[PDB]
Design a protein around this ligand. Structure first.
Ligand SMILES: OC[C@H]1O[C@@H](O)[C@H](O)[C@@H](O)[C@@H]1O
Ligand SMILES: OC[C@H]1O[C@@H](O)[C@H](O)[C@@H](O)[C@@H]1O
Ligand SMILES: [Mg+2]
Ligand SMILES: [Mg+2]
Lengths: 724, 724
């Protein structure tokens, strides 16, 4: 509908209707739900919600199905005075029913198209079941694998996170201006604004603190990129940002997000985050919480009641302007209008059962392809991998048969539809003997069984990993190790004298030195989703060739955290020249280097790269064009991730030794050669100074081209002169 | 001498003389040294120093003795054109020849007079050996025990650190305006400006980053308190402060230190930190390092050559004002004048040998007393301690005979003068059988010998600990554990069936859960210094009653870091009510609480505390007076540390759940009662807001009175109304 009519609607709403429009509830709080109706009476009572509230609520989250949505929306519209439909939102993080790899794995793909396809399939399915908005992409920069929510991020690099966040937004939304016509696309919601991933000591919901300059330099760019690409909503974070809970942080939300970033859509609280400013000690009671959160521009309170119970009194007493409320309401109505809800409140579903669009073989093949892009081959000593299809496999461990391979933040996908490692392997390999063990134990009976199977077979596929519940939200591990029984299993298997491949399933970087050293090959599958066992067999058999690269460093030990590629030099860097000397930046007990670095991953192929001759000088404002020729010099088709880093050698702020500024994943047949070109604009040379200006300074830069943050050629360019 | 004559010197100095005045050298770079003459030629060549530089250098650091000083100063004044004596500086950190407990141990004393006496003795001795300045107190707030330099700090509380820093400054300097007359006192130098203890991942020299507000709130107060108390010098830090190396950080050193803190003394670089701004990538070469360091107000370059080789070109070329150089020179000459050097360049020694003042029995008694104040009794199950003098003791382990008990940052103290654990115990206990073991090994032979000694005796004193070189500068440990052989030893000794007291020697919090569980008693001696074994024997025997309290939290495990008592609440605190629920701030694998908290320590005595009735309301600007009656209800004399904490329940910044704001250690005979009063001024109620203003806001505060950060009674005070 026309904008004037949307505005007319705000004019016609009562104060009570406006206030309720800013409330989001679970589906079973509404009449006409078709699941958990037993919960309705008591929770309404505990939250002090009445029909006047629920008949005028703005939004539902976590609808259980299309029939839930239709039932709720049909009942709601029979009673709603002005005919303002509900907007339905859901956590579609890495797939709906067809589950794709967890986002940290998708990070390791270094493949924008993989990420866009994942998001496109997710929306196809989730719109089929009645959802209008997804709480994705998650764009929190992560340096601390203790935090269980690293699985939701694409990792430690702001540029990669930025690029892949744009890819996700494009996949969910397509052309954002046509979300009222394209009903298999859905609105995206960027989360969590901001810097949630810096939770101190890896502890869920904990303190975040960093300088404003560092917040701009590293922690804000991915949110900004997704906002500029047209993400429709933004969601607040649970943490303080410089001492003030994000939800009520007016500088963050009004000055940065709405002002500088020019975001003009709905700002939704994380769950209960409005009320939880009271816990943080920055609001005395729900009245202050409501006032401060509305002052900060939070439009939609997720499942708490501060707005609903307090806004009327604040407005009547003159402590809050009703204009702020009208602004929030208008943004809510505009979101609904963008989704087409005033013309079709059922968004395509009313006369059109799209059941058939869910969990198709096509979508499954795309989830398999995502998993084979995202896995990272970490070790392969003496070409153990790929295995011949006639290889006799002893498949042993806790991940041999476990159906828990879909990942955390899987709200809608079902394990009954997933493919476990055994099932995947048996489709490919004729001879497999299986010995399942428990996740946290290694018995004498297990050892006897394992030794028998290994003796019978020729190679060991040792399937290790995490239960998904050991990560995700409020899954913090102080020690980033598998259960000790799993390391003991690996040590035992090594003694048996056969070659061992470890296929590792997990949601965070772990201490894997003991695994790498106890086996011949190490394949990081992360959690691949629905097709996990087929992803695993295809990579092991060579039907697919591993091409993922680490998007997050793997520490030597827990106590190395945080360790990351884009670090500062210090005043006393350890060099090859001074290594062993006491008075330099080092640990007495471990190397400075992570066990594996950003951008690292192995392949069954071998590749050669060469960079075309670069200018020795550049003007300010001028782009650097980097041309790279890559050849596959092996007999095996595969993909390589070409990475380009920049370093600012001297600056008014100490700058990182490298920062990723371009990447492309290149597919090459045996012997095939291709040429790729990158443009590093002057923005790539730029950074935030002590006064928070984004600046470009003349001086020397180094340009690194290669296949990891370590395996690079280095070039120098002197920037100066005039500004183009 | 008169100020006009000091200014006349500056006026008469040549540019080259003024430049060299800003250089500090090791003693053996000067003619007339009496030690390490073999190091002189090679190092002069490598630094490209000539006679013209050395005959005009401003200062010596690390003279080896009084005769070293006299020889150097005598030669220097024979050749110096204007008669500007050298100033001699040294690292006197926790004692000179009489070595006192390491600073982290002194923090555990919670005893201002102990710290002042330590610094007084240090100065008595250090002046007797010709030193004018010490590079102490170290006031870096520490929350990360991976960092080896925690041993230099008094711990994780800014108030404690502030109070003890002031005590050290008072001890070293006495009345600062009389340093020209009181020649057994010396100048103090506050270090390291600023925030060095926040080194990321515990890694030496590594990146520090925090918000400006947090810098002011927590990281600057102790420096400021020492500066306001009259500390003569400040030394720069190695780290970046918000991306700019402290040494060339103009905002930090010009705006904050000289401006806001009103410091007008010598700012000296940490060792090589001027040259090292190059390594950090914020200066391209020595010429820039010199320019930016002088712009930032660094007066004295410690053992690098940027100033000496580059200032003349910078000033001649008009890139740097000669007036900044004149300001630095005037500060150097004012220090020298403050120390009386223009009247007596030998500061009391030329005709007065003060060897009689070094390592006196009185000074040894003071060090023992400091050691018994600073040790922390952590466990004492079943009243194992104190031991009877007739107790038959098997003394076993790596600290049984090791002479390494003086601590890190012990430049001048000698192990031959220290008292080891065996020697200390045999002065007190008639029957001791000793089995020494290695720091990192546990052999079969050791086990046989330990088993035999334990069989023979009745109780085991298991002496474990760190070598001092595993801490101090560039002694970072990623895992804060003793060598695993020592945990294996404690496990072994537990099997032998006799009661075990573990006496732990160390420079950092460690993972001690496995020790506490493998023994009946656990006594944290840190490194007590020269009287170590007598301290140990006196506490074990009950001649002294433990009275130290932790000034730094002991983590559950390395991955809990950082963990500290003055933490924020979060939006989802774990409470006794919700413990067990998933969606709260917790770890899956460990408690939120540290293994032992701030302000914890046991005693042989038992105490009862009662707080007198408190007002329910307070005006803004008004002090709260807290009166506490304490009684020793046991038959054993002892000391207790009464602690007072304040909480700001609601604020415009999320405030810590508690902050220490007063403490007093109270000595009580059996059955004795005393009353102590504390004034919490309005400053105790104040904090830095989002604008960096220091404010007091009306509202609710809680007042906690007790004997640790956990063992407290709680009161509420509503602050509001008018101001004063
Ligand atoms: O410990 C203070 C200084 O001592 C010197 O001898 C070392 O060479 C320096 O690297 C160190 O910072
Ligand atoms: O995980 C998202 C949210 O889900 C809800 O079911 C929980 O009650 C919240 O504590 C949580 O933040
Ligand atoms: Mg530069
Ligand atoms: Mg308050």
């Amino acid at each position: 509908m026309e904008q004037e009519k949307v505005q007319e609607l705000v004019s016609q709403m009562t104060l009570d209707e406006k206030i309720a429009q800013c409330l989001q509830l679970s589906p079973f709080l509404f009449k006409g739900t078709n699941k958990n109706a037993e919960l309705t009476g008591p929770l309404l009572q505990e939250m002090k919600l009445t029909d006047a509230h629920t008949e005028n609520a703005g939004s539902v989250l976590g609808s259980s199905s299309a029939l839930d949505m239709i039932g709720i929306q049909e009942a709601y519209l029979k009673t709603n005075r002005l005919g303002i439909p509900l907007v339905f939102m859901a956590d579609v993080i890495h797939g709906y029913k067809t589950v794709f790899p967890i986002p940290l794995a998708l990070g390791c793909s270094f493949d924008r198209e993989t990420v866009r396809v994942m998001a496109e399939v997710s929306a196809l399915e989730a719109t089929a079941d009645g959802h209008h908005v997804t709480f994705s992409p998650m764009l929190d920069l992560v340096r601390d694998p203790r935090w269980g929510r690293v699985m939701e991020s694409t990792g430690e690099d702001p540029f990669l996170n930025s690029e892949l966040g744009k890819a996700m937004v494009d996949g969910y939304q397509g052309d954002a201006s046509k979300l009222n016509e394209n009903l298999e696309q859905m609105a995206a919601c960027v989360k969590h604004f901001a810097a949630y991933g810096a939770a101190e000591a890896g502890l869920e919901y904990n303190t975040v603190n960093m300088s404003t300059r560092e917040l701009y330099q590293n922690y804000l760019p991915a949110y900004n990129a997704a906002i500029q690409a047209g993400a429709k909503l933004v969601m607040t974070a649970f943490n303080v940002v410089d001492g003030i809970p994000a939800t009520m942080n007016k500088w963050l939300n009004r000055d940065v997000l709405r002002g500088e970033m020019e975001f003009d859509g709905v700002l939704i609280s994380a769950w209960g985050a409005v009320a939880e400013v009271i816990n943080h000690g920055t609001a005395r009671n729900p009245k202050e919480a409501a006032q401060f959160s509305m002052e900060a521009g939070v439009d939609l309170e997720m499942m708490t009641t501060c707005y609903i119970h307090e806004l009327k009194g604040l407005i009547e007493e003159g402590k809050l302007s009703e204009n702020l409320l009208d602004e929030a309401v208008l943004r809510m109505l505009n979101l609904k209008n963008d989704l087409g809800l005033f013309e079709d409140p059922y968004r395509g579903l009313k006369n059109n059962d799209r059941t058939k669009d869910i969990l198709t073989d096509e979508s499954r093949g795309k989830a398999r392809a995502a998993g084979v892009e995202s896995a990272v081959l970490l070790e392969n000593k003496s070409r153990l991998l790929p295995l011949a299809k006639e290889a006799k496999i002893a498949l042993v461990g806790p991940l041999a048969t476990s159906p828990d391979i879909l990942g955390g933040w899987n709200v809608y996908g079902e394990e009954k539809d997933g493919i476990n490692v055994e099932t995947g392997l048996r489709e490919v390999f004729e001879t497999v003997e299986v010995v399942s063990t428990e996740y946290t134990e290694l018995s004498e009976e297990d050892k006897v069984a394992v030794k028998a199977a290994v003796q019978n077979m020729d190679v060991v596929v040792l399937a290790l990993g995490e239960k998904n519940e050991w990560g995700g939200e409020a899954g913090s591990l102080a020690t980033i190790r598998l259960p000790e029984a799993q390391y003991q299993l690996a040590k035992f298997v090594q003694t048996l004298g056969k070659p061992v491949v470890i296929t590792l399933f997990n949601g965070r970087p772990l201490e894997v030195k003991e695994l790498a050293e106890s086996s011949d090959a190490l394949l990081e599958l992360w959690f691949p989703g629905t097709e996990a066992g087929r992803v695993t067999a295809d990579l092991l058999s060579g039907a697919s060739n591993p091409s993922g690269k680490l998007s997050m460093s793997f520490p030597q030990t827990t106590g190395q955290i945080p360790v990351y590629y884009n670090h500062l030099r210090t005043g006393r860097p350890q060099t090859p020249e001074n290594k062993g000397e006491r008075y330099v930046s080092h640990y007495l007990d471990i190397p400075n280097e992570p066990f594996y670095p950003f951008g690292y991953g192995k392949s069954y192929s071998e590749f050669e790269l060469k960079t075309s001759s670069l200018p020795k000088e550049l003007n300010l404002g001028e782009s650097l064009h980097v041309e790279v020729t890559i050849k596959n010099i092996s007999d095996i088709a595969g993909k390589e991730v070409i990475q380009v880093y920049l370093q600012d050698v001297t600056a008014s702020i100490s700058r990182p030794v490298k920062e990723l500024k371009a990447f492309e994943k290149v597919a090459l047949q045996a012997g095939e050669e291709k040429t790729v070109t990158f443009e590093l604009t002057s923005e790539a040379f730029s950074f935030y100074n002590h006064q928070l200006e984004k600046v470009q300074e003349p001086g020397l830069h180094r340009v690194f081209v290669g296949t990891s943050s370590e395996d690079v050629d280095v070039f120098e360019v002197e920037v100066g002169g005039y500004v183009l």
